[PDB]
Description:
Chain E: It comes from Chaetomium thermophilum (strain DSM 1495 / CBS 144.50 / IMI 039719). Chain C has 50 residues and is mainly alpha-helical.
Amino acid sequence: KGTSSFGKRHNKTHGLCRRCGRRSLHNQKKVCASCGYPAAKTRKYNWSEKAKRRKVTGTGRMRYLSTVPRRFKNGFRTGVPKGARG
Amino acid sequence: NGKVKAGQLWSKNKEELTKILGELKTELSQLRIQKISSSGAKLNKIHDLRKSIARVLTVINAKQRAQLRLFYKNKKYLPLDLRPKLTRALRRRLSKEDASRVLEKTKKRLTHFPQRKYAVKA
Amino acid sequence: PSHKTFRIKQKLAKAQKQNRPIPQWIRLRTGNTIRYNAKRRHWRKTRLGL
Amino acid sequence: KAQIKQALKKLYDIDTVKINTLIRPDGTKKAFARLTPDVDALDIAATKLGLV
Amino acid sequence: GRVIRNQRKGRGSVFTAHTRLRKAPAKFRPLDYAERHGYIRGIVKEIIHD
RNA sequence: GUUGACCUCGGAUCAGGUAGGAGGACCCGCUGAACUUAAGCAUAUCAAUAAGCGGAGGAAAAGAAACCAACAGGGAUUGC
RNA sequence: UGGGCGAGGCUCCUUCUGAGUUCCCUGGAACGGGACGCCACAGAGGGUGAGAGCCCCGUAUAGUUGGAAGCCAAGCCUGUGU
RNA sequence: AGAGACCGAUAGCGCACAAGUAGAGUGAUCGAAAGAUGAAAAGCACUUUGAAAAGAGGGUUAAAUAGCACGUGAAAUUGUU
RNA sequence: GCGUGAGCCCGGGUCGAACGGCCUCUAGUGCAGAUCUUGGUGGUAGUAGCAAAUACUUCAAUGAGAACUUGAAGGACCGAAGUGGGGAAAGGUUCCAUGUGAACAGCGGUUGGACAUGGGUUAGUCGAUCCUAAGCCAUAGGGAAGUUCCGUUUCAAAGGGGCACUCGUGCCCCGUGUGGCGAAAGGGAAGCCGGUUAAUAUUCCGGCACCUGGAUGUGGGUUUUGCGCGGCAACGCAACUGAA
RNA sequence: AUAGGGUUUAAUGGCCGGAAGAGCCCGACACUUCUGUCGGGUCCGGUGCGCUCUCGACGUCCCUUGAAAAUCCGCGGGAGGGAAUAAUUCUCACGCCAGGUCGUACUCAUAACCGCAGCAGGUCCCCAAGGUGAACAGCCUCUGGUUGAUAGAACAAUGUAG
RNA sequence: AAACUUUCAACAACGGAUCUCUUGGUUCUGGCAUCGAUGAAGAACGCAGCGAAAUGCGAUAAGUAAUGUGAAUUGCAGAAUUCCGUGAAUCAUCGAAUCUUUGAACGCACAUUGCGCCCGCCGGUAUUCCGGCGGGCAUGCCUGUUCGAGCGUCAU
Lengths: 86, 122, 50, 52, 50
Ligand SMILES: [Mg+2]
Ligand SMILES: [Mg+2]
Ligand SMILES: [Mg+2]
Ligand SMILES: [Mg+2]
Ligand SMILES: [Mg+2]
Ligand SMILES: [Mg+2]
Ligand SMILES: [Mg+2]
Ligand SMILES: [Mg+2]
Ligand SMILES: [Mg+2]
Ligand SMILES: [Mg+2]
Ligand SMILES: [Mg+2]
Ligand SMILES: [Mg+2]
Ligand SMILES: [Mg+2]
Ligand SMILES: [Mg+2]
Ligand SMILES: [Mg+2]
Ligand SMILES: [Mg+2]
Ligand SMILES: [Mg+2]
Ligand SMILES: [Mg+2]
Ligand SMILES: [Mg+2]
Ligand SMILES: [Mg+2]
Ligand SMILES: [Mg+2]
Ligand SMILES: [Mg+2]
Ligand SMILES: [Mg+2]
Ligand SMILES: [Mg+2]
Ligand SMILES: [Mg+2]
Ligand SMILES: [Mg+2]
Ligand SMILES: [Mg+2]
Ligand SMILES: [Mg+2]
Ligand SMILES: [Mg+2]
Ligand SMILES: [Mg+2]
Ligand SMILES: [Mg+2]
Ligand SMILES: [Mg+2]
Ligand SMILES: [Mg+2]
Ligand SMILES: [Mg+2]
Ligand SMILES: [Mg+2]
Ligand SMILES: [Mg+2]
Ligand SMILES: [Mg+2]
Ligand SMILES: [Mg+2]
Ligand SMILES: [Mg+2]
Ligand SMILES: [Mg+2]
Ligand SMILES: [Mg+2]
Ligand SMILES: [Mg+2]
Ligand SMILES: [Mg+2]
Ligand SMILES: [Mg+2]
Ligand SMILES: [Mg+2]
Ligand SMILES: [Mg+2]
Ligand SMILES: [Mg+2]
Ligand SMILES: [Mg+2]
Ligand SMILES: [Mg+2]
Ligand SMILES: [Mg+2]
Ligand SMILES: [Mg+2]
Ligand SMILES: [Mg+2]
Ligand SMILES: [Mg+2]
Ligand SMILES: [Mg+2]
Ligand SMILES: [Mg+2]
Ligand SMILES: [Mg+2]
Ligand SMILES: [Mg+2]
Ligand SMILES: [Mg+2]
Ligand SMILES: [Mg+2]
Ligand SMILES: [Mg+2]
Ligand SMILES: [Mg+2]
Ligand SMILES: [Mg+2]
Ligand SMILES: [Mg+2]
Ligand SMILES: [Mg+2]
Ligand SMILES: [Mg+2]
Ligand SMILES: [Mg+2]
Ligand SMILES: [Mg+2]
Ligand SMILES: [Mg+2]
Ligand SMILES: [Mg+2]
Ligand SMILES: [Mg+2]
Ligand SMILES: [Mg+2]
Ligand SMILES: [Mg+2]
Ligand SMILES: [Mg+2]
Ligand SMILES: [Mg+2]
Ligand SMILES: [Mg+2]
Ligand SMILES: [Mg+2]
Ligand SMILES: [Mg+2]
Ligand SMILES: [Mg+2]
Ligand SMILES: [Mg+2]
Ligand SMILES: [Mg+2]
Ligand SMILES: [Mg+2]
Ligand SMILES: [Mg+2]
Ligand SMILES: [Mg+2]
Ligand SMILES: [Mg+2]
Ligand SMILES: [Mg+2]
Ligand SMILES: [Mg+2]
Ligand SMILES: [Mg+2]
Ligand SMILES: [Mg+2]
Ligand SMILES: [Mg+2]
Ligand SMILES: [Mg+2]
Ligand SMILES: [Mg+2]
Ligand SMILES: [Mg+2]
Ligand SMILES: [Mg+2]
Ligand SMILES: [Mg+2]
Ligand SMILES: [Mg+2]
Ligand SMILES: [Mg+2]
Ligand SMILES: [Mg+2]
Ligand SMILES: [Mg+2]
Ligand SMILES: [Mg+2]
Ligand SMILES: [Mg+2]
Ligand SMILES: [Mg+2]
Ligand SMILES: [Mg+2]
Ligand SMILES: [Mg+2]
Ligand SMILES: [Mg+2]
Ligand SMILES: [Mg+2]
Ligand SMILES: [Mg+2]
Ligand SMILES: [Zn+2]
């Protein structure tokens, strides 16, 4: 054990995950140790509040949900303003 | 050259719109060929030409959508993208006529004994 | 190794791409505080996670 | 390779005999195109605005 | 204490049976009409060791 | 016999539809501890609580008596 | 005990709003000190080369320019018993 | 959206800054340091010693006892008189 | 200068925008210690030390400066189970050229796997792709309040082949069986020599070949005894019908 | 059986093509360079408990007998189809067309991987010259590779190694 | 007597306390109810005249259309517009579009930019082979249509 036995480390337990991007995909088990892939549920537990906030809604791009508040304010309308050209 | 103003693009037919897109795409590729080892006012033309293609593409698409919507008027089923998109929850509420229906016996009482307008004096 | 995959091959291109210093004309803007690249990675200093 | 050969014929009306490709370290694709012997390549580079 | 040795053998993880080199099990023919009323015969091809 | 019904059970990239995931501060259920207190400790206490699991809304749940009372009788539910 | 009109009123967005850069001293620069004035249903707050009601944005009051869609409702006009 | 007998850069949320970032762990997870030149860059032309970094003159500024190691610049510890 | 005391007040120097007295109200309100918490700095001290793997030397060039940069000439070591020539795992531009102040290479540095700017990895034949092994996971079904556990042919109505129509939509046979993943060292269709670049080649250039799949024509073969002849034989030759 | 005569599985064997036109070794002329041109030669035998790889026929050991699938071929059988002026489903010779997608640079270690680092540690394989000698032992040399580990002067004690 | 050690002041060092400042936190009150198979939250790779990060966007890629305002942007360059009308801007608003590879993720799979099937069009002599382009193929359940199985069973 020690320095002599540390030189035999040239393998990989984990690899890149397709759903979360972290290097936490067990190669032999084929399940992610962070997001629970390939299960439909995403891993999440209440005994760690820090972990939940690291991937909660609003920490990414929010491509679609960010424009909803503006659409609700106008009542979800359709059409063009009176005499617009087109 | 210069911009392709969006003002006059609206008064065109489909064929000549596709034609103008034809020349527009051509020299943009051609001008990128000789951009190497030189840089001047021609660098403003790539940003000029790139946006011009964007305008005509929207005009063709917008004209196609408007004419397509005319076809599907007075039709029970129309494609998914042409259907209004409000919200998943808002698309499953009961329609106004269905949520306003009442039983026959309930309407009978409401016809003869509705809410009255009254006042009591001091 | 010489044997790679397109996913690892693609990943190594970006890591090399974002590893050169900032352009000179950035520091001449008004109200600028950036001094140098603070995310410099060197193959002899830090091991990127694949 | 099949799409690359079609593009050159429609856009520079030049014919080729074979095409070899590779992916550069930065992530872009570079292709070598060899022309038919009867066609000359030195003048096409000049006449098609390629720097010479 | 811990689980003693002869309790672990029922889990069947390391103490299973090696069956790579065994070709088939030894059985008679299924009981059929020919063998219930008369007889049939067959040739012996090989005598093998498993 | 021929032919036409009935009941049950299936096929189809048949016509038209619908469910999953996220969020979970507050709300409706199930499951379920020990540290601690008793100057020790086992019933008890912490607690019908933390963790685990299922299902919704802008509020949810509850609700027009198989009720409270023993009076000269009150009159759905919720909160202070 | 059916149908149809309907003044007028209320919500939302958008146009505009009072009064010193007067004189002298210190200072790189008055928004400071001294003298004389003005506005105030506006002396909340911020900026401008130092503590600014009157230099600038805003602030108080009811009105005013223009526009869109739903409500509420005074009071009228008309059928009728299988 | 409006407020306070609240804290004032070792305080207040872990984060007033390209902060759930840099970095550590095979992994679940752990997780910082770092705000202030001047009203205006007017961010030191030109000469001279040096291989160069820089120095000495001379300049900008109300001030360089404000020179991008920049407001004010305390103590421990150090140099010269 | 004042007070027994905690403390209060003034003079001089530096600096640049806010701050006190008096009576009440309020609190995250007074430090030398807790092997206290975070940051900073000393004595020891120019001290311990920089000693395995046999070893260096003369002249010239470059340069502000050369023991550890370059050329030539001597002297040595590794001594084919190498300090040689190529690969698997892992690293990710460290590879090549031009240039360079500081920092790094525990001495120096003109040199560098460091710093700055550009450039470099070509395949029908070499691998992956195909098949299965130990093993993992869907389907039919049964458990569990539930996240899910068992199950891999099991108490299942589980499949695919041919033909013709103007035109897809009409016919006709067979049926015990019916999924995927899992090896760059196992199983497996096919490429060799010469030359070439600052940096790649069984790939690029020149010459000479091969395999699989798909279309079609000439030469030769066979047949009027309709699907070839010879040798006692082992068998021979350029071909020489063959569905379930 | 011996003996005489025949058929056949197996070239990394002999000869000819490919192929001397190539590669290599000498000689004689040319000159800022773009540039070179032209001559000759490229043979014949021997040896072995030698070293290394590969193929073949025998033999020994076991209460141990030393994987599966895709893929490819032959045979038994006799369905169907087909000429006398041509027809032909001839696995024979020659000829026509096409072959997509991703990896390929460099190190593999007393400096490119893991040990906090440019760490006397650890980490799977291929090729393998001459002499002494039983020998992949130890000691010396050739091809190829290094001359890199902070240096200069003096020689007391006490040490570490011989 | 110097040197050396020690104490104080002046100027110069090392270090970042103190005073003043604040586009940030923290607590209370008030108003509102709006994610997703019509592809959400999250992840990956890309886009600028000169960009690594942050911010923004998706091959129409540091944006396009439409409405309003009415002369900029700025580190450099370049031109653009100049208000006649044909309209500057990292402006404000936002009712029409685009939206790569993925993800509940859906032809089968994935440690592979892997391997298939169905329909139509265009090329190479082509219903069968190869190439290019466009549109499709997941599971549970409900309602209806259509084609079927069974001496479960009724009538000639
Ligand atoms: Mg091991
Ligand atoms: Mg591996
Ligand atoms: Mg799946
Ligand atoms: Mg993220
Ligand atoms: Mg390739
Ligand atoms: Mg359907
Ligand atoms: Mg469905
Ligand atoms: Mg749910
Ligand atoms: Mg407690
Ligand atoms: Mg107790
Ligand atoms: Mg106790
Ligand atoms: Mg106890
Ligand atoms: Mg109890
Ligand atoms: Mg709970
Ligand atoms: Mg309420
Ligand atoms: Mg309710
Ligand atoms: Mg009742
Ligand atoms: Mg009662
Ligand atoms: Mg009650
Ligand atoms: Mg009205
Ligand atoms: Mg005003
Ligand atoms: Mg003056
Ligand atoms: Mg004054
Ligand atoms: Mg002020
Ligand atoms: Mg003011
Ligand atoms: Mg005044
Ligand atoms: Mg402070
Ligand atoms: Mg803080
Ligand atoms: Mg600080
Ligand atoms: Mg403080
Ligand atoms: Mg903090
Ligand atoms: Mg890590
Ligand atoms: Mg400071
Ligand atoms: Mg000076
Ligand atoms: Mg000089
Ligand atoms: Mg001053
Ligand atoms: Mg001065
Ligand atoms: Mg100052
Ligand atoms: Mg300092
Ligand atoms: Mg200072
Ligand atoms: Mg001091
Ligand atoms: Mg100030
Ligand atoms: Mg305290
Ligand atoms: Mg203290
Ligand atoms: Mg004390
Ligand atoms: Mg400390
Ligand atoms: Mg110390
Ligand atoms: Mg010493
Ligand atoms: Mg040493
Ligand atoms: Mg030592
Ligand atoms: Mg020494
Ligand atoms: Mg040594
Ligand atoms: Mg020099
Ligand atoms: Mg010299
Ligand atoms: Mg040396
Ligand atoms: Mg030796
Ligand atoms: Mg030697
Ligand atoms: Mg060996
Ligand atoms: Mg080498
Ligand atoms: Mg160099
Ligand atoms: Mg050094
Ligand atoms: Mg040095
Ligand atoms: Mg140097
Ligand atoms: Mg190098
Ligand atoms: Mg570098
Ligand atoms: Mg070919
Ligand atoms: Mg091969
Ligand atoms: Mg393949
Ligand atoms: Mg298969
Ligand atoms: Mg299972
Ligand atoms: Mg079930
Ligand atoms: Mg496979
Ligand atoms: Mg193999
Ligand atoms: Mg070739
Ligand atoms: Mg060739
Ligand atoms: Mg062929
Ligand atoms: Mg013939
Ligand atoms: Mg046969
Ligand atoms: Mg014989
Ligand atoms: Mg020959
Ligand atoms: Mg020759
Ligand atoms: Mg010759
Ligand atoms: Mg010998
Ligand atoms: Mg061997
Ligand atoms: Mg190589
Ligand atoms: Mg090696
Ligand atoms: Mg080593
Ligand atoms: Mg390392
Ligand atoms: Mg030897
Ligand atoms: Mg000998
Ligand atoms: Mg030896
Ligand atoms: Mg070497
Ligand atoms: Mg020495
Ligand atoms: Mg001695
Ligand atoms: Mg001794
Ligand atoms: Mg004293
Ligand atoms: Mg001082
Ligand atoms: Mg999308
Ligand atoms: Mg689909
Ligand atoms: Mg679908
Ligand atoms: Mg694989
Ligand atoms: Mg065709
Ligand atoms: Mg096709
Ligand atoms: Mg498709
Ligand atoms: Mg049916
Ligand atoms: Mg029937
Ligand atoms: Zn994951």
